[PDB]
């Protein structure tokens, strides 16, 4: 079954860091960054070759203009929330994430969620066509947005607009999104304080899902293992490392097993 996802995330900060933009908007198709806007560059730009290649000029200019409008509203949002919570200056951040998921071309999710200071503030419930106030300070937002009937347009966007464009994007990036890149794997070992730590690292795989397991005498050994999760290389590939602690002199009992979409059979690797 063909699953695809479109997710936009947006951050507004009082304190982004020196020389960094206070407002950043980025979109991802199937987990891959594809468009970017910020308050410094003041323009939506491509972040993959396929969207650069296949999107017309009105795509960029059209969204650049919406981006600038959105930036003005989100600048005010940050101020309003600080005043509502009776904060005066300091570090505060507003975050939004919204988008849609399709399965065999048909919608299965459409969502819109906002956070203030790293916690849930409001979310759209598309079923009831309401906004859920997660904290007391969200209640005035709920009332205002319900009064304005913005739920109608939002549901149209999530169920029609978002889905239509996701279908176009997956066609555009079909080659790239569908590719497979094999991991380059290395096993390494280091003894210290009477503990042998074996490491198994998979470098440069795509797509993102992978299973890297330590075997002891041929059996998965998952308690003793520590994974660092799946982390990005930022060229559109991924990395992961898993370690297991062994007794010195027991290295030859252990084997790393790598399972990935690019590999018809699992890779097996030993500590040499």
């Amino acid at each position: 079954m063909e699953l695809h996802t479109l997710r936009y995330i947006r951050t507004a900060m009082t304190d982004p860091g020196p020389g960094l933009p206070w407002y950043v908007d980025v979109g991802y198709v199937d987990g891959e960054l594809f468009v970017h806007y910020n308050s410094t560059a003041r323009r939506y730009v491509p972040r993959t070759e396929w969207i650069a290649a296949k999107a017309d000029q009105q795509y960029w200019d059209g969204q650049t203009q919406i981006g600038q409008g959105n930036e003005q509203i989100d600048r005010e949002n940050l101020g309003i929330l600080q005043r509502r919570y009776n904060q005066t200056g300091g570090s505060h951040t507003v975050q939004w994430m919204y988008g849609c998921d399709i399965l065999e071309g048909g919608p299965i999710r459409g969502y819109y969620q906002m956070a203030y200071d790293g916690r849930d503030f409001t979310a759209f419930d598309k079923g009831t066509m309401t906004f859920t106030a997660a904290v007391p300070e969200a209640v005035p937002t709920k009332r205002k947005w319900e009064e304005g009937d913005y739920a109608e347009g939002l549901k149209q966007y999530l169920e029609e607009t978002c889905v239509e464009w996701l279908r176009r994007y997956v066609e555009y990036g079909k080659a790239e999104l569908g590719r497979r890149e094999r991991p380059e794997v290395r096993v390494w070992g280091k003894e210290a304080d009477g503990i042998l730590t074996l490491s198994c690292r998979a470098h440069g795989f795509y797509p993102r899902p992978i299973v890297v397991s330590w075997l002891k005498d041929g059996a998965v050994r998952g308690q003793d293992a520590h994974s660092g999760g799946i982390v990005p290389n930022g060229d559109g590939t991924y990395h992961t490392w898993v370690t297991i602690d062994a007794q010195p002199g027991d290295g030859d009992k252990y084997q790393c097993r790598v399972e990935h979409a690019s590999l018809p059979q699992p890779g097996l690797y030993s500590w040499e």
Partner: peptide
């Protein structure tokens, strides 16, 4: 294609 913001919070 991104959302066009409605009113402030």
């Amino acid at each position: 294609w991104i959302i066009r913001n409605w009113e402030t919070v």
